[PDB]
Structure 1
Amino acid sequence: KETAAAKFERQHMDSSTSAASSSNYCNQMMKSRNLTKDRCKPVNTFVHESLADVQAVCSQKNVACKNGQTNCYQSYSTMSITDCRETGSSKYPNCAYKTTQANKHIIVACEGNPYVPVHFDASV
């Protein structure tokens, strides 16, 4: 059904907000993007840059993926992101998260034709 590329956009792209803002951002976004459907997804990152800029990372610095694969890339420029981390008192289906804004280089895995992001590996 949903392609890996489309899933990446649903899970990691949010260009509408320059920095997400609002302490409720993650609680609202993790739910709206259906990341709390089956379970409370532990951690998830939203990137506040244009789709084009994020897709372009696939042609940037080639770095090893955490899983050992070689199709991961690190952005040369830092990007505005928001990490969503589940709290301790968080109990499904009422998933709770802490919203933390940051400016770091992102690392994503890319594949396909067009060669686009299909997984968010890390931020550094």
Structure 2
Amino acid sequence: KESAAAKFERQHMDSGNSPSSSSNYCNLMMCCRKMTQGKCKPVNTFVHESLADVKAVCSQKKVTCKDGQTNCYQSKSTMRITDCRETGSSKYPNCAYKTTQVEKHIIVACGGKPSVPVHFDASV
């Protein structure tokens, strides 16, 4: 019975800067949050930075996304994301995730008074 945001965050703001590894965080978080149910997540972008800033990003700069949908917000600065993907190897229940470390502006979706980020659009 989360306000969406908290769960969205735990699915996305993995947290803690770490410019290394890749696969480890990818599979670890998915396992930890047991999102490796019925079918696993072919793509998901894991943020590894100050969760406090995410709530600020939400309340920083609206950008018209590649649709003009929601009211998506671009981060102040480029943040550490580990862009997580299932390799052409992932075989549920033997799911196999691999991340791509990139420093890009997360594009988050804020709402749900008091305004908190509840979805993600993309990162650039």
TM-score norm. by structure 2 comes to 0.87
Task: Measure, in 2, the Cα distance between the counterparts of 1:32 and 1:112.
Answer: 26
Percent identical pairs in the alignment equals 80
Residue identity opposite 1:64 in structure 2 = T
Task: Measure, in 1, the Cα distance between the counterparts of 2:5 and 2:25.
Answer: 23
Cross-structure match for 2:45: 45
What's the C-alpha RMSD, in Å, of the aligned pairs? 1.8
Residue identity opposite 1:21 in structure 2 = S
Cross-structure match for 1:11: 11
How far 1:19 moved relative to its partner?
Answer: 2.2
Task: Measure, in 2, the Cα distance between the counterparts of 1:91 and 1:46.
Answer: 21
Cross-structure match for 2:117: 117
TM-score norm. by structure 1 comes to 0.87
Residue correspondence of structure 1 range 52-63 to structure 2 within 5 A: 52-63=52-63
Instruction: State whether structure 2 residue 26 is matched by structure 1 residue 26.
Output: yes
Task: Measure, in 2, the Cα distance between the counterparts of 1:19 and 1:66.
Answer: 30
Task: Measure, in 1, the Cα distance between the counterparts of 2:108 and 2:9.
Answer: 12
Deviations 1:49-71 (A, max 9, x none): 11110110112221234564241
Residue correspondence of structure 1 range 39-118 to structure 2 within 5 A: 39-66=39-66, 68-118=68-118
Cross-structure match for 1:35: 35
How many aligned positions are there? 123
Is the Cα–Cα contact under 8 Å of residues 13 and 48 in structure 1 kept in the other structure? yes
User: Is 101-110 or 57-66 further displaced after alignment?
Assistant: 57-66
Q: 1:43 to 1:122 in 2, by over 3 A?
A: same
How far 1:40 moved relative to its partner?
Answer: 1.0
Gaps of 5+ in 2: none
